[PDB]
Amino acid sequence: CSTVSPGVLAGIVVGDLVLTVLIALAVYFLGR
């Protein structure tokens, strides 16, 4: 079938990646 699971859930992994780069950038922004 079209299988929705590999769609929305797939989107969650994508969201995690976005937060990974965004947050990381925030880490650099803070600076040690």
Partner 1 sequence: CSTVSPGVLAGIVVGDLVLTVLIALAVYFLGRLGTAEVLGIISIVLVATVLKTIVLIPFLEQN
Q: 3-state DSSP call for residue 4?
A: coil
CB of 11 to partner 1, least distance (A): 6
Site for partner 1 in 1-32 (CB under 8 A): 1, 3-6, 8-13, 15-16, 18-20, 22-24, 26-27, 29-30
Q: How far apart are CA 4 and CA 22, in angstroms?
A: 27
Task: Say if residue 28 carries a ligand binding annotation.
Answer: no
25: enclosing H helix or E strand: helix 5-30
List of residues contacting partner 1 (CB under 8 A): 1, 3-6, 8-13, 15-16, 18-20, 22-24, 26-27, 29-30
